[PDB]
Design a protein around this ligand. Structure first.
Ligand SMILES: O=c1ccn([C@@H]2O[C@H](COP(=O)(O)OP(=O)(O)OP(=O)(O)O)[C@@H](O)[C@H]2O)c(=O)[nH]1
Ligand SMILES: [Mg+2]
Ligand SMILES: [Mg+2]
Lengths: 49, 1254, 139
RNA sequence: AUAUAUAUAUAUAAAAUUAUUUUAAUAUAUAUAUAU
RNA sequence: AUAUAUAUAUAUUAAUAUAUAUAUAU
RNA sequence: UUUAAAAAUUUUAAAAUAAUU
């Protein structure tokens, strides 16, 4: 995932890389839950690439 | 004709025509005793069977080959069987038996193995050994019953001679075909005929105490005993359960095909799933209607609280959607020639399209037609087939994920890419939290865990002894002691004054073997671990327990099955919901060192390290060991006692286990065998299995599922499931509930795909999940479909009794317990109530007399629980079996008849001028003595087991034994200091109020006796019991017990039928329908059990834990005698100290005792009134609470008034109301208090003097 | 860890029994069958080497409470001493090392075989229910 | 080298969950009352 | 004549296999 | 001025019956 995201920077016009659907918190999540907090952390670090 | 001419009065008595009496009972019992087997088969000859019972019997059943070609001899001089098809054919074969027998001296038509063959085999011959093994194993297969089959058949003829019955509820004679439509009886008679032939003797073998004698006929084989047992079971079930005669024919056909094959047990084992697979697992491919329960599971699911909320109607959308079961079923049916039977079942099942009483009865009947034999095979075959299985680990832990060694253990690197890291984390956290608790560090908990496994059962003390001998260490022998030799008590007494470094060599010693057969499953296997090996395995079991009870918390262990487990299936099989059945095949063989035990031992060794840094565990030192877990560093690091034990346990688990097999069925087999299969005798077994099950399922759903499936449906299904809300497991088996969403039943393809993912998950680390998804629940051998429990009648064979050895059976009167158990097993399965009761009457006579005779009056059997029929000129069939057993049951059935009961007495002579408050003027004291009521009532209360007296061992060696045992119990200075301080304080203060105050010094004096009575009884004790029973029968009695006398002062009143507690169209248990009137009415008017109401006055003053050697009775009586007399608190504290408690803990318990005034413990100890067994399935709690009213119907009376400071009396009143209400047939009714002779205060004072006198 | 056990004890014993009498410092302990049943010959199963004072002590130990079914054959072996191969299966218990005390240097491996230096004729083989028995010379 | 009879001794068969039933004289004697 | 309870007194402690020795015969 | 709530504890150690892993 890391290397292919890095390689997709220079094929922007034919292929667009997105984060997988199954990485987002369950049912939208809720900040009353530790696991959803850490899911948000992982997403926030991973999205800019 | 014959049976009628013999005992017409008995036929009239038990069939609800003539009033019962002791004279007809004893005369019938005479007829049963003085009666021969030829008489049995002649009576069977008298039966004119119709064409309905007719059937074509295969002639191959009689001509069979010789046993020699089926066996051979191993390279290790072991005689073992030669499999011809598959590695399963290792059971007894079907062969001739006549050419190996020598004629018995008295009965010239019967005989056992020729002594020439046995002696020649003992010399060491090949053929002699093979022949003697075959003979002994065939005898063992023919010895798997509990009594001679002809006796059960005679009881059946006795019961059925009366004909049909009249139903007091339905108002008509039931339509159950007579014996002339009973094809099992026909096959029994025809087989016995064709085997006997011209010979006058008719029985094909006579079951005896020592061994079975075969009828010397060339038409004989080794398959006949099990075939006859099957036919007897099927006949009895068809007559007392109303199976239809269209499925009993199929059952008889399958039994015949089994008897006509190579081996019988093997065919029955391969063909054990044709009735369930074609009826239960294929129902309702098309629904049209019917009702199913609407249960709702309460929110903190983990506690298992339910609530019934009515019956919801079914519809077409809830039809069966699991995958089809057609191709595989027909393949199985074709491979064994049972294709016509399979097609008949598969056809007849497709005609039921409504969830109804009739369809559940169809399933019950189709599933009661499977054979219920105890499968048997030689021990050397079990040990060589089971124990050779090894795990199939397809993705092992990489070698680069283990650190260096720390003694005997390596640690998982924190950066492991495997799936074992979640296992490691779970066990690590569990071990840390277990060891952190301060409870696990006192001497009392240490001692309790030590004494947990010191029992009177064997532990293979020999190999322990001869392994300690190999390092030149001695052991006391205690010559001349009447105690059993192979008992863990004996080992513990030996190993008292021995350092751990000495006895630690006995941890690698081998284990002996145990065996046990079953119904429809291969013979069990067993291994008892010795005392050291049970000691060193303490952290494993403690961590498993902590995981089961606190961390994972998804299990039913430690919970009552009939209050929490039944309605789990009722909920998980209701239609909107679904159920998946998950089992682990060969669970023991799949837990080894390369995936489970290594990770678990590293985890438990690391977690305990923090809170046990220098302390000793249960008598284990604080040893040292060097570690290399960190690269470049190598330093000796101290460890703890609880880590030293893990070191030794790991060096045991790494090598595997060695089993010493020595079977008594094949002469010359005493080899030793070494496996890696996890033992089934360890204390830690049943807890660690369920812990591993729960852990792997949770790591499944949380990690492995979402990382290997792509479709959104399976992901959304695995994300909405958690092991605590959708999974229940106990040991090997398991259950996974899948709730129904709003769109209805969850889709089927997604559930299937998840199932194959689970199957692929098991193969990576060894396990082989046996998954079954077909629309029925499965848990602990309880079947459910659409919320209707379905009893499995084939699992409760009426005649079957298991004998894994060659030892003789316990002598009469030891069989009456088994007969009562047969009656109760019939009760819990919903058999036809009138037919089953009558058959049990007929059967409790045949086992009533035996040699100077001694006979039981029927009143004893009525005391044990069996309900009457027609006593005292009442109406036929008034009493149900739900009448409790003992004094409560006696009061119950008496009070409902008392007026007629006394007018009959006065109508036949018995009259006196004494107005008794109960029976008026009739003299019960003379008639009940005449009618033998007191005799049975007081003979039933006498024990039927030889009380093992002390054989007066020598004083020196007995003193030494008890002293060494006490030294083993109180090993550390802290327990001894506590108990000695307690004794000192007692002699300072408590001296005088008690003379032998119980402490931790009387525990060895109970272990010594418990070693005593594990031995064999002597002829002295048998003669003593016989003479005691005769004496108790030959007295003249004047009254009942004091408790029953006090009970009989209370009258009641049957006012109103309570409202229904369940719909009258909702099947809740197959077999309990309007055809079964009384159980149906009781179930529908009382309602099933969904609550928790345990412990109706089990109060006691001792609320703490101590060694298993002590008793609650002695401590409770001491505390009660010390609290009623009002002594100083220092006396209570001294007692609690010398019973082994801490100062602060003992004083908190003293404060407890000072609270909770003692008017309740005294009554709880004086009276013995409990909820009988049969009420466990019903809702008796609300019946106690709301529907037994102590304020009579028309208000106060001045007699039923109860004083304010006597509240315990309301308990006994609620007892008597509920019992008297449940005893009568029909619906349960509101019962009101009526009148207490004397008065409330007088009866209270009567109970209070008894409570005081303690 | 294994080769040290294999080699080291023999080198030390070679200093103690380097020059003593071989007849006085020697022994051998195998499975015994009586002079009958020829339709005495013992299979070695072990070869002890130790000083005389310990051979005297080993001469009196039990050595008889260990049983096994020996199955003699009639096959010949190419080796020099005329001997017939055999087999054996211990029954009940295995010989603990404590009997061969820490003062003798025994062997860890052995083949099962019997020598026939009398009336050379190999008849039919059989099983005999042997019993363990110490076997040294006069010493 | 063995066979039979006798006497003595020894070894072997587990853990857990659930529900039900039973576990404070051993005996006698004197004085008290009662029942048969 | 018997039994039950009341106070006291007294004595009181509670299947298969194998091994060994004797004897008789070969 | 009179009445009354009374304690619902445990995991109860062993021996027998039955069900199960
Ligand atoms: O005879 C044994 C039967 C099993 N139980 C205990 O149950 C646990 C699992 O028992 P098993 O391991 O025998 O079940 P299984 O694999 O044979 O299942 P199938 O292949 O037939 O589907 C083991 O841990 C054992 O201790 C024993 O107490 N008694
Ligand atoms: Mg199984
Ligand atoms: Mg099992």
């Amino acid at each position: 995932s890391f290397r292919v995201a890095l390689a997709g920077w220079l094929y922007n016009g034919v292929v667009t890389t997105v984060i997988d659907d199954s990485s987002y918190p369950k049912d939208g999540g809720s900040v009353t839950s530790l696991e959803n907090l850490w899911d948000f952390f992982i997403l926030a670090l991973a999205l800019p690439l | 004709s014959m049976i009628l001419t013999q005992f017409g009065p008995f036929i009239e008595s038990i069939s609800g025509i003539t009033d019962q009496s002791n004279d007809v009972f004893e005369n019938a019992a005479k007829a049963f005793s003085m009666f021969t087997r030829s008489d049995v088969y002649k009576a069977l000859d008298e039966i004119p069977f119709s064409e309905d019972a007719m059937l074509p019997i295969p002639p191959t059943i009689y001509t069979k080959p010789s046993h020699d070609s089926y066996y051979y001899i191993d390279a290790l001089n072991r005689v073992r069987r030669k499999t011809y098809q598959g590695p399963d054919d290792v059971y007894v074969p079907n062969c001739s038996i006549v050419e190996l027998l020598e004629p018995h001296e008295t009965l010239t038509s019967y005989g056992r193995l020729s002594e020439a063959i046995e002696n020649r085999a003992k010399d060491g011959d090949s053929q002699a050994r093979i022949a003697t093994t075959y003979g002994r194993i065939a005898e063992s297969q023919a010895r798997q019953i509990k009594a001679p089959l002809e006796k059960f058949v005679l009881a059946l003829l006795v019961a059925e001679a009366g004909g049909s019955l009249y139903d007091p509820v339905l108002q008509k004679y039931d339509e159950i075909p007579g014996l002339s439509h009973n094809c099992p009886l026909w096959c029994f008679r025809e087989i016995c005929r064709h085997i006997s032939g011209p010979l006058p003797d008719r029985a094909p073998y006579l079951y005896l105490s020592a061994g079975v004698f075969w009828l010397m006929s060339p038409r004989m084989t080794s398959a006949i005993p099990p075939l006859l047992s099957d036919l007897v079971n099927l006949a009895i079930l068809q007559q007392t359960a109303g199976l239809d005669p269209s499925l009993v024919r199929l059952g008889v056909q399958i039994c015949l095909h089994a008897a006509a094959s190579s081996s019988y047990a093997w065919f029955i084992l391969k063909t054990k799933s044709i009735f369930p697979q074609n009826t239960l697992h294929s129902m309702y491919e098309s629904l049209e209607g019917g009702y199913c329960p609407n249960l709702e599971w309460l929110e903190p699911r983990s506690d298992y609280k339910f609530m019934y909320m009515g019956a919801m109607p079914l519809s077409t959308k809830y039809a069966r959607s699991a995958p089809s079961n057609d191709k595989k079923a027909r393949e199985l049916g074709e491979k064994y020639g049972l294709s016509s039977v399979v097609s008949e079942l598969r056809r007849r099942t497709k005609t039921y399209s409504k969830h109804d009483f009739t369809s559940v009865r169809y399933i019950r009947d189709a599933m009661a037609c499977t054979s219920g034999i105890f499968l048997v095979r030689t021990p050397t075959e079990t040990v060589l087939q089971e124990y050779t299985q090894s795990p199939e680990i397809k993705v092992p832990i990489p070698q680069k994920d283990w650190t260096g060694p720390i003694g005997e253990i390596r640690i998982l690197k924190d950066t492991t890419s495997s799936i074992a890291r979640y296992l490691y984390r779970t066990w690590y956290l569990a071990a840390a939290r277990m060891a952190a608790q301060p409870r696990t560090w006192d001497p009392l908990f240490q001692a309790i865990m030590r004494s947990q496994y010191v029992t009177a059962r064997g532990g293979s003390g020999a190999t322990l002894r001869e392994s300690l001998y190999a390092i030149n260490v001695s052991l006391p022998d205690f010559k001349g002691l009447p105690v059993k030799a192979a008992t863990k008590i004996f080992q513990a007494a030996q190993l008292a004054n021995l350092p751990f470094s000495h006895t630690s060599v006995a941890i690698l010693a081998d284990t002996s073997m145990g065996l046990r057969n079953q119904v429809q499953r291969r013979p069990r296997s067993i291994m008892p671990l010795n005392v050291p090996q049970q000691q060193v395995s303490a952290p494993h079991t403690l961590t498993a327990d902590y995981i089961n009870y606190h961390m994972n918390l998804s299990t039913t262990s430690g919970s009552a099955v009939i209050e929490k487990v039944i309605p789990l299936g009722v909920y998980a099989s209701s239609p909107p919901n679904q159920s998946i059945n998950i089992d682990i095949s060969a669970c023991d063989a799949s837990i080894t060192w390369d995936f489970f035990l290594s990770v678990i031992m590293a985890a438990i060794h690391e977690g305990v390290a923090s809170s046990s840094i220098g302390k000793p565990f249960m008598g284990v030192p604080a040893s040292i060991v060097n570690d290399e877990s960190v690269v470049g560093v190598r330093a000796a690091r101290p460890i703890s006692g609880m880590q030293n034990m893990i070191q030794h346990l790991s060096k045991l688990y790494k090598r595997g286990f060695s089993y010493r097999v020595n079977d008594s069925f094949s002469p010359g087999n005493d080899f030793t065998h070494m496996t890696t299969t996890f033992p089934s005798g360890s204390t830690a077994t049943s807890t660690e299995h369920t812990a591993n099950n729960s852990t792997m399922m949770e790591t499944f759903l949380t990690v492995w599922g979402p990382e290997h499936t792509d479709d959104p449906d399976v992901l959304r299904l695995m994300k909405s499931l958690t092991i605590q809300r959708n999974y229940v497991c106990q040991g090997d088996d398991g259950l996974m509930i899948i709730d129904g969403n709003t769109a209805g039943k969850v889709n089927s393809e997604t559930i299937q795909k998840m199932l194959e993912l689970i199957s692929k998950y098991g193969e990576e680390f060894g396990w082989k999940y046996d998954i079954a998804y077909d629309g029925t629940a499965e848990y602990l051998k309880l079947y459910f479909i659409f919320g209707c429990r379905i009893p499995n009648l084939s699992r409760h064979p009426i005649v079957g009794k298991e004998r894994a050895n060659s030892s003789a059976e316990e002598p009469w009167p030891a069989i009456l317990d088994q007969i009562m158990g047969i009656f109760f097993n019939g009760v819990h399965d919903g058999l036809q109530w009138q037919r089953w009761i009558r058959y049990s009457w007929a059967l409790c006579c045949a086992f009533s007399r035996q040699r100077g005779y001694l006979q039981y009056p029927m009143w004893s059997f009525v005391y044990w629980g069996l309900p009457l029929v027609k006593v005292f000129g009442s109406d036929p069939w008034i009493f149900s079996w739900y009448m409790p057993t003992g004094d409560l049951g006696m009061y119950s059935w008496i009070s409902l008849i008392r007026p007629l009961m006394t007018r009959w007495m006065v109508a036949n002579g018995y009259v006196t001028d004494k107005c008794s408050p109960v029976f008026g003027n009739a003299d019960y004291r003379k008639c009940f003595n005449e009618l033998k009521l007191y005799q049975g009532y007081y003979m039933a209360q006498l024990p039927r087991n030889p009380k093992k007296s002390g054989r007066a061992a020598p004083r020196e060696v007995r003193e030494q034994f008890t002293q060494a045992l006490s030294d083993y119990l109180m090993q550390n200075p802290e327990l001894k200091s506590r108990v000695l301080r307690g004794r000192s304080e007692w002699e300072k203060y408590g001296a005088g109020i008690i003379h032998n105050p119980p402490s931790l010094f009387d525990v060895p004096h109970k272990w010594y006796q418990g070693a005593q009575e594990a031995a064999t009884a002597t002829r002295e004790e048998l003669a003593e019991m016989d003479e005691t029973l005769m004496r108790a029968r030959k007295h003249s009695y004047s009254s009942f017990s004091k408790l029953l006398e006090a009970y009989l002062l209370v009258k009641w009143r049957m006012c109103e039928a309570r409202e229904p507690s369940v719909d009258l169209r909702l099947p809740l248990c197959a077999g309990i329908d309007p055809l079964n009137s009384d159980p149906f009415l009781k179930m529908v008017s009382v309602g099933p059990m969904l609550q928790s109401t345990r412990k109706y006055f089990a109060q006691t003053l001792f609320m703490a834990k101590t060694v298993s050697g002590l008793d609650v009775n002695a401590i409770d009586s001491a505390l009660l005698r010390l609290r009623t007399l009002g002594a100083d608190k220092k006396a209570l504290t001294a007692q609690l100290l010398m019973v082994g408690l801490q100062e602060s803990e003992a004083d908190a318990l003293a404060g407890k005792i000072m609270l909770q005034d003692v008017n309740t413990v005294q009554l709880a100890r004086v009276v013995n009134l409990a909820v009988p067994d049969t009420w466990m399935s019903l809702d008796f709690d609300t019946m106690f609470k709301h529907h037994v009213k102590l304020l009579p119907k028309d208000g106060r009376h001045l007699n039923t008034d109860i004083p304010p400071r006597m509240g315990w009396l309301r308990a006994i009143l609620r007892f008597l109301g509920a019992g008297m209400a449940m005893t009568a047939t029909g619906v349960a009714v509101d019962i009101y208090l009526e009148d207490i002779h004397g008065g409330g205060r007088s009866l209270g004072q009567r109970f209070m003097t008894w409570m005081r006198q303690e | 860890s294994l080769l040290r056990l294999l080699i080291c004890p023999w080198l030390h014993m070679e200093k103690l029994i380097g020059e003593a009498d071989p007849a006085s410092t020697s022994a051998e302990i195998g499975w015994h069958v009586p002079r009958e049943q020829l339709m005495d010959g013992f299979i070695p199963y072990v070869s002890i080497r130790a000083p005389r004072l310990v051979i005297e002590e080993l001469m009196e130990k039990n050595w008889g409470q260990y049983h096994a079914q020996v199955i003699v054959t009639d096959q010949l072996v190419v080796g020099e001493p005329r001997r017939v191969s055999a087999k054996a299966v211990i029954k009940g218990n295995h010989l603990p090392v404590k009997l061969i005390s820490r003062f003798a240097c025994f062997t860890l491996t052995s083949k099962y075989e019997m020598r026939l230096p009398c009336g050379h004729s190999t008849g039919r083989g059989a099983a005999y229910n042997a019993r363990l028995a110490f076997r040294s010379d006069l010493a």
